[PDB]
Symmetry: C2
């Protein structure tokens, strides 16, 4: 995988020119795209900018995020050929920092369950996860140093885990979702994919300009609370094997690890995530459902058809439960620095299953809003398995810091 930190360093000293770095990415995309299919559109003419911390840095953009120079098709036939007038604010944050938007990466239709044609870089017979399929696969295949995706359920952390890349779903609403196709406004969060936690920090620093992302260093003796999210049921063997390996490596590296049960209120929040999500989706995709119903990809069409009845009353109650969950979750972080849990149910599903994977181990955290970071741990049968590091809301820096610590601990 291409390291954003490495490129920045070599570009800053003058060892690598911005143009050469971009040419590198075009070549890397050309090398594996015919086998992975991570891009909806690769702008072969994309050039490097001459200034900024991200000069010479190629970035892939999930196709539900607006671009003014390339189409944004939402992974749906309904938006085939659709060309937004402006670049979404998050896209502009990257461009103003000197980055090159090298192409639009694949997304499932409207960021839901319907699989894209993208294949897992580690084994093409498997799913790269979703809904940020192409962004995870592109980074995983060593095509680009950075990519943007989104998470409403587990569309950033799950695919990152399946593809063995580092990734972060920042604190809710920190990055604007303007120009980002909405599924659920109470949940949609923009995320980033990269080689390592350090790359994610560098990316957020250039995008936001916030000092909290400057000078991040691996955490020392982090106080970790292991949460297996029992309410979501047991995970597949590979995921547990990965968590156990992460725990052992953390303990050997000096971290204090303890198993913790989340408050009942939090379990309830996990239970109603679907209510909030599906109720809002009907409002957010109202035009599509009302005017192009049969044109909506099969799985999403089915889920929407099955939830037309969700009422404003049960929705409001769900939100109340969600808010209480966030409050009580904060109490958990009084005795621990970060939470460690699963990033997915197990290894990436075979493409034959027509599934991007169950988001059950990701959804609670999107609703709570906390910053989540995927840390690649190991591989079973050649397929990546990762773990999820979670910090207090707004403590993104420390989540990246602990993730970095975990990466080093796993490398020994």
């Amino acid at each position: 995988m291409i390291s954003l930190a490495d490129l920045q360093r070599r570009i800053e000293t003058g060892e690598l020119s911005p143009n050469a770095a971009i040419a590198q990415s075009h070549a890397a995309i050309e090398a594996r795209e015919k086998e992975v299919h991570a891009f909806v559109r690769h702008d072969k003419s994309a050039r490097a900018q001459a200034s900024g911390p991200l000069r010479g840095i190629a970035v892939g953009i999930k196709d539900i995020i607006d671009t003014a120079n390339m189409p944004t098709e939402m992974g749906s036939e309904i938006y085939r050929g659709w060309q937004p007038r402006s670049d979404a604010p998050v896209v502009m944050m990257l461009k103003r920092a000197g980055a090159t938007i090298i192409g639009k990466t694949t997304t499932t239709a409207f960021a839901s369950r319907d699989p894209t044609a993208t294949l897992n870089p580690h084994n093409t017979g498997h799913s790269p996860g979703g809904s940020s399929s192409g962004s995870a696969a592109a980074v995983g295949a060593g095509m680009i140093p950075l990519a943007l995706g989104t998470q409403t359920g587990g569309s950033v952390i799950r695919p990152a885990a399946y593809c063995g890349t580092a990734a972060i779903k920042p604190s809710f609403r920190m990055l604007p979702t303007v120009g980002v196709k909405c599924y659920s406004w109470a949940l949609d969060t923009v995320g980033l994919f990269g080689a390592r936690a350090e790359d994610l920090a560098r990316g957020l620093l250039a995008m936001t300009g916030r000092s909290e992302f400057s000078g991040i260093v691996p955490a020392k003796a982090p106080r970790i609370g292991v949460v297996r999210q029992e309410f979501a049921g047991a995970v597949e063997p590979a995921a547990e094997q990965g968590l156990q390996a992460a725990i052992k490596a953390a303990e050997r590296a000096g971290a204090s690890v303890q198993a913790i049960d989340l408050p009942e209120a939090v379990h309830e929040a996990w239970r109603i995530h679907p209510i909030i999500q599906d109720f809002e989706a009907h409002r957010a995709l109202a035009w599509e459902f009302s005017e192009h119903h049969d044109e909506i990809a099969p799985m999403l069409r089915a889920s929407l058809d099955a939830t037309v009845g969700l009422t404003p009353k049960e929705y409001d109650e769900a939100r109340r439960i969600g808010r209480r969950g966030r409050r009580e979750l904060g109490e958990v972080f009084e005795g621990v620095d970060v939470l460690l849990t699963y990033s997915a149910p197990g290894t990436a599903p075979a493409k034959a299953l027509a599934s991007t994977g169950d988001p059950r181990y990701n959804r609670l955290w999107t609703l709570m809003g906390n910053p989540c970071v995927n840390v690649p741990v190991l591989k079973v049968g050649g397929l990546p398995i990762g773990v999820q590091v979670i910090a207090r809301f707004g403590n993104d820096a420390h989540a990246l810091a602990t993730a970095w610590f975990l990466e080093d601990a796993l490398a020994k």
Copy 2:
């Protein structure tokens, strides 16, 4: 002005036909458009729908809100002829309820300070306010029974007061802003314009389907807290004339009125509203500012140019200040049901001043997020003056209930 609730009742009993009601709006529009200039585009072919609570109800939509069958030009030459692919979720809420989207009402460029060509219905020589210029004007000129607008500063409450219409800026984030051009995501809130409080209530019931908007009746013996927002500056005589009149009428109606002071934390939130708004505006309009700078209307271009230096640090601090303000504001509602204050500095400015009016008595509330309702009170020199009713966050119903009580109180 046309009453939505009136049309509803008559249509429901068969006393009035939906086609007749719609034909009446088309007529009212043509009757005074060449005088008011409230519409960017009037869809003369629009007809009444066959079912739903809003059948036969013509609705004007502020032109920063997406429509699939009509251009959405954002009041800017940059978006001339721009045609969104879909109808914004809030537009679909209206259509699904049976409403007729009769046209797009004028908006200042990107909903900022640049005046439109729309004139105040009460006096063609005066401004109708902004940024929802056309929606307030159209309703005030008796053209339509309902109109959608937005508020970031005071773009719903102020123009409503200027044009003498009822209007509500609901609790922040209740109505989705998907498909609504963003200025500041921490503030942008969709609002409604109507003849009276009752009309707004029926509109929200149809759009949201929430029981809280069903069966709303005038409030009884409301507990009112009068806040003149001294921290906002010196008010014009006309506005104080209206506030005193409202207080007198309320007291005579049985309301318990008392002047109260707002927590210093709240005064501070008012002070930093500009920091939040302008910093986010740069991110939200990054593409336009970077790629079409000289094409941005004069006044907005100047405000953006003057605020390019706002830092993430001071912005983050401003947001922290906003949160403290919200936290301490809640305590104020322990003794009073609603707060009562000015809706604008005074009477609508003359067009010659090239100003849509100062939002200083409005901005605080958009940041706090509480529901706000404008209640027309009286006229000075032929120009409307209203008062602003404010309820606790989430209590939009009570805000409307109390606004109703006030309208009838002023009606002696």
